[PDB]
Amino acid sequence: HHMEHNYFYKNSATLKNKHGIKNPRKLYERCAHETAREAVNFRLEPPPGKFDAAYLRTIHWCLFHNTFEWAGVTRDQPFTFEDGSTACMPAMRPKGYKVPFAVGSQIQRELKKLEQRLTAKNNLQGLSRQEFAANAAEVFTALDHAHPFRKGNGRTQRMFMEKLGQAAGYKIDFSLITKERMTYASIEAMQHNNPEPMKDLFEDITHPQKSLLLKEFISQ
Ligand SMILES: [Br-]
Ligand SMILES: [Cl-]
């Protein structure tokens, strides 16, 4: 427990970061700006053969390394800052209460089980738009629950979905959807055992690209 605090500046609830910012809202704004810039290039990268914990670490590093020393490192892992201090957070405990996200080494076991399900399904390549959306919703819910990093989980997870989609010929567009909707769908699937909303959300954000790109390509 005592190591949790070493993610933050002394006497503050602000995450240590490479910009030196000590206001948590301003940190958020700068972090949003830096990761948006990095996501533009990461979208053009070729996809790996496995969608696993190493790939998630790769995404997290690529998106957050300008902001966080521990970019690419999961929160179950002791991390030592340049300042000498060592941080980790095996359990999310807001206000001292347990919330139902993966704890400790459960993070790695959940990500493993997710790679194994995806690998066995050829990473969802060769499926209809609807069937892809229905599986992709389940993947998204698995990642919600894993919450592998200290911070940056949402953007990391969305990017993982974009790349899985892209490798299957689909644009996954989270800009189509409101925050309130994503929260509703996440809680339904995680707390109320109700997959339908996340399924309907993925049907709304999964758009076939193969044919459009081929048209564009030939016109050019
Ligand atoms: Br982003
Ligand atoms: Cl400090």
Author numbering: 0 to 219
Copy the relevant paper text.
Proteins containing a FIC domain catalyze AMPylation and other post-translational modifications (PTMs). Among these, Bartonella effector proteins (Beps) comprise a particularly diverse ensemble of FIC domains that subvert various host cellular functions. The FIC fold comprises eight conserved α-helices and encompasses a characteristic active site loop between helices α4 and α5 that forms most of the catalytic center and the substrate binding pocket. Additionally, FIC domains generally contain a β-hairpin between helix α2 and helix α3 that is referred to as the “flap” and mediates docking of a target segment in extended conformation via β-strand augmentation.
The structures of Bhe_BepA, Bcl_Bep1, Bqu_BepC, and Btr_BepC exhibit all features defining a FIC AMP transferase as described in the first chapter and elsewhere. However, BepC proteins are special in that they have a lysine instead of a Mg2+-coordinating aspartate/glutamate in the FIC motif. Thus, BepC proteins appear to require no divalent cation for substrate binding, in contrast to all FIC AMP transferases characterized so far. For the FIC domain of BepC with its non-canonical FIC signature motif, no enzymatic activity has been found although it binds to the RhoGEF GEF-H1 and activates this signaling protein by relocalization to the plasma membrane. For BepC, despite its canonical signature motif, no catalytic activity has yet been found, but its BepFIC domain mediates protein–protein interaction with the RhoGEF GEF-H1, thereby activating RhoA signaling. Bqu_BepC FIC crystals were grown from a solution of 10% w/v PEG 4000, 20% v/v glycerol, 0.1 M bicine/Trizma base, pH 8.5, and 0.03 M each of NaF, NaBr, and NaI. Data for Bqu_BepC FIC, B15_Bep8 FIC, and Bcl_Bep5 FIC were collected at 100 K on a Rayonix MX-300 detector at a wavelength of 0.9786 Å on beamline 21-ID-G at the Advanced Photon Source (APS, Argonne, IL, USA).
